[PDB]
Design an enzyme around this catalytic site. Sequence first.
Site, mmCIF file in Angstrom:
data_model
loop_
_atom_site.group_PDB
_atom_site.id
_atom_site.type_symbol
_atom_site.label_atom_id
_atom_site.label_comp_id
_atom_site.label_asym_id
_atom_site.label_seq_id
_atom_site.Cartn_x
_atom_site.Cartn_y
_atom_site.Cartn_z
ATOM 1 N N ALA B 10 46.688 24.343 5.868
ATOM 2 C CA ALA B 10 46.495 25.777 5.857
ATOM 3 C C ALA B 10 46.862 26.207 4.442
ATOM 4 C CB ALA B 10 47.332 26.433 6.953
ATOM 5 N N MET B 12 49.510 27.359 3.388
ATOM 6 C CA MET B 12 50.875 26.907 3.129
ATOM 7 C C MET B 12 50.921 25.412 2.804
ATOM 8 S SD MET B 12 54.102 25.702 4.505
ATOM 9 C CE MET B 12 53.851 25.679 6.275
ATOM 10 N N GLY B 13 50.206 24.589 3.577
ATOM 11 C CA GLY B 13 50.168 23.160 3.290
ATOM 12 C C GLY B 13 49.483 22.847 1.970
ATOM 13 N N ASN B 31 43.654 16.759 6.657
ATOM 14 C CA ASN B 31 43.526 17.859 7.604
ATOM 15 C C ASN B 31 42.360 17.550 8.531
ATOM 16 O OD1 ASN B 31 44.587 20.741 8.210
ATOM 17 N ND2 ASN B 31 42.362 21.011 8.254
ATOM 18 N N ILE B 74 51.578 20.962 11.336
ATOM 19 C CA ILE B 74 50.580 21.361 12.314
ATOM 20 C C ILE B 74 51.160 22.455 13.193
ATOM 21 C CG2 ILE B 74 48.900 20.519 13.955
ATOM 22 C CD1 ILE B 74 50.115 17.630 12.843
ATOM 23 N N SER B 128 61.200 27.643 4.625
ATOM 24 C CA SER B 128 60.926 29.070 4.598
ATOM 25 C C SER B 128 60.470 29.490 3.211
ATOM 26 C CB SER B 128 62.143 29.880 4.985
ATOM 27 O OG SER B 128 61.829 31.261 4.866
ATOM 28 N N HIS B 185 67.668 31.513 10.779
ATOM 29 C CA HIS B 185 67.106 32.191 9.613
ATOM 30 C C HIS B 185 66.106 33.260 10.043
ATOM 31 C CE1 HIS B 185 63.821 32.890 6.808
ATOM 32 N NE2 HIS B 185 64.719 32.778 5.846
ATOM 33 N N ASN B 186 65.145 32.873 10.885
ATOM 34 C CA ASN B 186 64.182 33.838 11.389
ATOM 35 C C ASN B 186 64.845 34.892 12.268
ATOM 36 O OD1 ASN B 186 62.208 32.451 9.982
ATOM 37 N ND2 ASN B 186 61.134 31.679 11.792
ATOM 38 N N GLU B 189 66.253 37.140 9.800
ATOM 39 C CA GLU B 189 65.132 37.806 9.132
ATOM 40 C C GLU B 189 64.641 38.999 9.954
ATOM 41 O OE1 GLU B 189 61.588 35.255 8.302
ATOM 42 O OE2 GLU B 189 60.423 36.849 9.294
ATOM 43 N N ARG B 287 60.290 45.326 18.660
ATOM 44 C CA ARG B 287 59.003 44.652 18.584
ATOM 45 C C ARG B 287 58.358 44.554 19.956
ATOM 46 N NH1 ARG B 287 58.244 40.032 14.080
ATOM 47 N NH2 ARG B 287 59.728 40.753 12.482
ATOM 48 N N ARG B 447 85.025 43.370 40.181
ATOM 49 C CA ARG B 447 84.478 42.125 40.696
ATOM 50 C C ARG B 447 85.364 41.528 41.773
ATOM 51 N NH1 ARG B 447 84.705 37.963 38.029
ATOM 52 N NH2 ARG B 447 82.913 36.948 39.030
ATOM 53 N N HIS B 453 86.462 37.632 43.386
ATOM 54 C CA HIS B 453 86.347 36.631 42.345
ATOM 55 C C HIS B 453 87.655 36.355 41.619
ATOM 56 C CE1 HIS B 453 82.010 37.623 42.930
ATOM 57 N NE2 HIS B 453 81.910 36.318 42.748
#
Lengths: 468, 468
Positions: B10, B12-13, B31, B74, B128, B185-186, B189, B287, B447, B453
């Site tokens: 792609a 990126m690759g 590819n 991939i 990243s 990280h994501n 992010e 989101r 509880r 409990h």
Amino acid sequence: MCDIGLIGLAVMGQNLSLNISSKGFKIGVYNRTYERTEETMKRAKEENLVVYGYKTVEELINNLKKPRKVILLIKAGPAVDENISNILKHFEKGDIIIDGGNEWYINSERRIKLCKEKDVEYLAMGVSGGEAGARYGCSFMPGGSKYAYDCVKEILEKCSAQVGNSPCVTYIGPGSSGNYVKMVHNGIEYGDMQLISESYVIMKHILKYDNQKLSEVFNKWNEGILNSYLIEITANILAKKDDLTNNYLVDMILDIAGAKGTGKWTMLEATERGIPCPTMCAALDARNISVFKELRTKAESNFNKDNILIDPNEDLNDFENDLLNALYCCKIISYTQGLFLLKQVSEEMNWKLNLGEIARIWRGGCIIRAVFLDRIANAYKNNEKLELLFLDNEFSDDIKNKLPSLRKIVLMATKYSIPIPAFSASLAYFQMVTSQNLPLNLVQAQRDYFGSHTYRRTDREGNYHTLW
Amino acid sequence: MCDIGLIGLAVMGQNLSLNISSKGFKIGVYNRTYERTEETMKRAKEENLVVYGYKTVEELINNLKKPRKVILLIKAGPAVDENISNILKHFEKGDIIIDGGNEWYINSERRIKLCKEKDVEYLAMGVSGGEAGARYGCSFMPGGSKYAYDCVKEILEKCSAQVGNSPCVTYIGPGSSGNYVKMVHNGIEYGDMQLISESYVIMKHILKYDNQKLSEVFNKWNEGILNSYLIEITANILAKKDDLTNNYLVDMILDIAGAKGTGKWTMLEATERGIPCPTMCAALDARNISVFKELRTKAESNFNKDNILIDPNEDLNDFENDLLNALYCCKIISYTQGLFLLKQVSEEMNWKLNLGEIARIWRGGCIIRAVFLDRIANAYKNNEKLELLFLDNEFSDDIKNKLPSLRKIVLMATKYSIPIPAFSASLAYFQMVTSQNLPLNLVQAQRDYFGSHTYRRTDREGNYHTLW
């Protein structure tokens, strides 16, 4: 000679068998530890009820009327699976298994299929109500084989909590849907308890109420619109005095209460499916943060939490009643998320859930029992297509009237450094869900900038990439 | 004849392949759709670099020196396992497989052992940097075989982003630890993007800034402590004008951006492990909320947010500088949650993660890169066993000085119905984690009331049950 069998005799299993025997049914009973079987037979005697105790599983199977019906109340784990395999050696076509433990719905589906391989009908049924509801009347949420439902239909109606003359039981839908509804019940339960506990801190640190006034204020709310089982016991709990000290007992309980079992599952399922449940984030955040008490006490040592000096001319004349409206407002917001999750999943599973009936059976028996649920049931009686709960006309006007009370509670808790994640999440949730345009247009732009992930436009169709 | 192979071309690759040869290495490349492989050679030729393209997987393996090294890029799915089964047919002992995709760590763990059965050493590596970082220098997060790390080390040091002269690559640890840190990280992010987007709406709807002023504010924030890649590009994004309209381009992007992939994963893992990440709920809720545009539009029709009229009784002379301090303060809080999750999982997995080195390699190349990360590296160099990030001496003073700015931004957004879940969650998280006693004592009492409990006490040993 027995109408129904029951496996597993904790105090919950003991209470329910006396409840089934109390309504005139021939109940068989088993427990791997025999002493518990005998303790059930003792109290049956002392309540002039008859419960037949057996010593091996297969000895119980043989004394039920055909088609055979067994309720399982085993702690989830490999043990529930052994017992089902053992039950299957002796059942044949038409016989019925009822699992009553709090089970991850995927395990029940997987068993529901294994039992139809042997022509045995499975019924995965959630039960809520504690030991008291187990004895005198609880909320049953059975799901699975419709055939199995009709054979146990009589027994569950009379042992369920009775609100008016309708029993707290309904056919939930096919497959493992009943486990799922009981899960979402515990999710809502987690939210209510957190919203209540945040009201406890607000009045304790802003209004400086002592525990006696706090219990009196909660009883007064329980007479009004906030009438609920949890609001009632908080009034009892904050009034209870310690026997081993001069302190209040609630002030001597240690604040480590982790997220156990069914709580995480509803949040895991909200995360995976993309159905936002912010009020349950805040409730789970609060529980998971409490486990790290050693880290919390060294944290507060570095950031001194001093006493709260209220401003002398700050308007608190109506504050208690604004907090009452805020709490009611968050319950509408919090239930809106829970019922939205249940509707989305019901469509993905071809379950055909009747949220009017789900609300109805939660009016009594269960922990979240409250007059407020009867109001939700009428919203669905009035429109069954209703998508968000606060879009009902009566909840709409409630929100419009009480949202300024919620804004005042968050404003004051923010001002005076009182942590209220559930109040904040519910207010933030409401503002976002009612925003036609959100700043995710910038989020899409940032992602296109660094990843070339494309975006869509307001004016035209198609995917677009920009050279920034 | 090749130093290394790469599968997946792609953009990126393609960029990473050009990067590896521009640093004096012979790289073979494949590819599935051969048409992209040929375009990689054309870009290599027009940029005076040499890349060997192979029509077939098999011819690429047969031109790799020993020990053979192949990178996989991939799209995650069944295609990843197909190549690995296919690659393992022709590899021998001591050869290395490097998965560079964003993978769920459990999948990688299964692949590592399935590879060691044929004595092939596996290296699961997160990367990243977008496509720009792929060509000129990215952040590498390799984990797995330490042997594998040493054989590829030279290439990753030369192809990683360079900060000072230290490369943004480190040996993360054994197994699939590298996939996990790319996941967090994501996760971090996502929060940064949400916090920036909440700063956008506040300045747009409270200060009434236009896109030109907004772009100007972000750039001057970029000159200071908020110096970061994400602050830089949103300044660029807010200035860009549309070619198809007379509007700013960001105002023409549609605001539907659902959570997909490694985003949900960080939250799924924090929920399961009981580590609270409230700021990451807010990012994922925002989101997830944005997908339901039809419902948000129906919702706002009923709850019109008509007037956003700032009362001219409000002190906004310092508000913009309060917001900078608010945004910086949430970055410390948010990273504190993120790093705490990393530390706890490293202890449950015996990964022995070096959080100073994770921070060091995030200073360049990756999407969350910021000067702010250089402090985090030194915070851990100064204190190796540092458990919460804001308990470091200089972040602690940072919180104490900037938190009053944080409270004012929450205060002003609450008053004016501005949804800011990430700002609210970050503040509630901080006030809770820094509180030695939280109202979970009331939760434990409830509880015990309905479930028996049991609870634990402030003063003594043991389990307790109360009859309330």
